[PDB]
């Protein structure tokens, strides 16, 4: 493994988790 | 040396060096060398005139050449098959193959005398 | 290596018996390592357990400190 | 030959081998008795194998005969050279180098260079004057070439067979020999391989005389064959 693959997946996951954190309230008001 | 049963391969073989797999089967006279460039060059230099060769695995020329080489080295000439099995060629090997070997040898005799 | 440290035999361990436990406790009061005490694994385990029991039960010092 | 059968072998101590620490597994059939750790050669089939080696060297000398006596161990340094010089048979004794058997062109070039220098250096040192550190360095190069090359002088072409002592030390010789398809006859103890030797002679290889009697008997065989070549011609 070149660790680059893990870094790419790491950034994608971290960005999605940040999106979930910032939109936590709206999802529980109407949605998942 | 490569065992030719009358201008064709003795029996089907599958060779592989590294990753270059090459399949060879004998063909009826007049079929030609149905082979890819590198394997076809190897067979044409070896003198096989009726053969069906397929290149499985990697297409690198060097590795395909080595795979054709050990596929040909895996060939097992009928007399030495008989020696291996402790029997006779008439007892081990197909009558059609032996016959075709005689007609090839005799046509060879014709060519030699004509010279 | 460790074969030159010949295997030593002790028989019964008997945490009450302070003589063997003193022979296997270090001059500072610690338990000696296996490669220096020359014991089998089972005998070393029994000696360590007996030393701990004697320590808790006042027959041996937890650390002899000053020599 | 007869070599008084097993009497000479037992008196010399050929039956000695190596202990259990290191061993070639292809010696399972070749086990007599586990005596004091050192493995024991039965020394019975040894007579048959040395007889077969004698027969092959007779056949090789009948077809003309060129045996290269290769040796490097301190137990054979002072033994190989004397018998090889007595029989007039090519030998190498110090630092069998990578090549020779495969570097034929380079080694022949060095043979010609040694042949010319062995005359021109002597002529220059005995005749016209010459400055120091030039004649000295040419003489030193001559000495190094003489040390690293002995009986290799006399070979017109590729040899016919190679005689190996302590194949573990002289491993490269057998690789070159198998690459160029020359017959090999070698002393092998309980740690060597029969796959890389065609005419295999088991026996000890750690004593000076243990290889010395074998090299002497094969030297006698070579001398007898060279004598018979006069009538063979």
């Amino acid at each position: 493994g070149s660790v680059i693959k893990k870094r790419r997946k790491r950034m994608a996951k971290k960005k999605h988790r940040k999106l979930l954190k910032r939109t936590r309230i709206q999802r529980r008001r109407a949605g998942k | 040396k490569v065992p030719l049963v009358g201008r064709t391969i003795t029996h089907p073989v599958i060779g592989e060096k590294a990753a270059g797999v090459v399949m060879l089967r004998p063909a009826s006279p007049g079929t030609g060398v149905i082979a890819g460039g590198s394997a076809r060059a190897v067979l044409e230099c070896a003198g096989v005139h009726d053969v069906l060769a397929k290149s499985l695995g990697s297409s690198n020329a060097i590795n395909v050449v080595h795979a054709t080489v050990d596929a040909l080295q895996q060939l097992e000439e009928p007399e030495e098959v008989a020696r291996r099995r402790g029997k006779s060629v008439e007892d081990i090997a197909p009558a059609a193959m032996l016959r075709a070997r005689k007609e090839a040898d005799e046509a060879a005799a014709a060519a030699r005398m004509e010279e | 290596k460790v074969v030159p440290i010949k295997t030593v035999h002790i028989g019964a361990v008997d945490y009450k018996d302070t003589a063997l436990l003193r022979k296997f406790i270090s001059e500072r009061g610690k338990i000696r390592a296996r490669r220096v005490t020359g014991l089998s694994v089972q005998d070393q385990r029994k000696v360590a357990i007996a030393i701990k029991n004697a320590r808790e039960l006042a027959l041996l010092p937890y650390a002899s400190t000053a020599r | 030959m007869a070599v008084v059968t097993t009497r000479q072998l037992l008196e010399s101590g050929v039956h000695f081998g190596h202990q259990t620490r290191r061993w070639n597994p292809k010696m399972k059939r070749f086990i007599f008795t586990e005596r004091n750790g050192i493995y024991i050669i039965d020394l019975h089939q040894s007579l048959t194998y040395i007889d077969k080696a004698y027969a092959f060297v007779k056949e090789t000398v009948a077809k003309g005969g060129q045996i290269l006596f290769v040796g490097t161990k301190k137990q054979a340094q002072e033994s190989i050279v004397e018998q090889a010089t007595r029989v007039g048979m090519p030998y190498v004794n110090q630092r069998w180098l990578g090549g020779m058997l495969t570097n034929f062109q380079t080694i022949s070039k060095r043979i010609a260079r040694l042949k010319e220098l062995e005359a021109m250096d002597f002529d220059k040192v005995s005749g016209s004057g010459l400055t120091k550190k030039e004649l000295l360095m040419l003489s030193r190069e001559k000495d190094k070439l003489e040390k690293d090359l002995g009986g290799i002088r006399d070979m017109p072409k590729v040899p016919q067979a190679v005689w190996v002592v302590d194949t573990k030390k002289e491993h490269l010789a057998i690789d070159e020999a198998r690459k160029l398809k020359i017959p090999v006859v070698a002393i092998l103890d309980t740690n060597c391989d029969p796959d890389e030797v065609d005419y295999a002679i088991p026996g000890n290889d750690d004593a000076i005389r243990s290889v010395s009697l074998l090299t002497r008997i094969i030297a006698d065989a070579a001398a007898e064959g060279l004598m018979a070549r006069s009538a063979g011609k």
Binding site: - | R84, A93, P94, M97 | - | -
Partner: protein, 134 residues
Amino acid sequence: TMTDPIADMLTRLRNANQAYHDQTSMPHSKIKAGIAGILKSEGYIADYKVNEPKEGEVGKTLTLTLKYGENRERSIAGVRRISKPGLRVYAKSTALPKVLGGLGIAIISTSQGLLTDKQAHEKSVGGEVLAYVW
């Protein structure tokens, strides 16, 4: 656990032949003995023998002694199991397999006992294609 004793026989023979062993041994079964017999009759092994149990005292032991020619040359170029327990292969009298262009032999269990392809074709009988020994 053991699933295909015939495949075990074939792999034992292949491994022993590759390692240049003179003899190989295995627990005995009737079909194993038959295959060993036809292997001997076709010249792929030197001989075979069924031994009454005397070490484990439990069951018969089938032992195959192999043959290597001049300059230590394999008499078996390979052996392959065809009718696997997971997927069984049956061949008709007309669709009998050819091994190594006819140089090798397929071992076929027919209704008339174990018969090499050549035999079966002569008798016009098919069956279960056990092996492709060549």
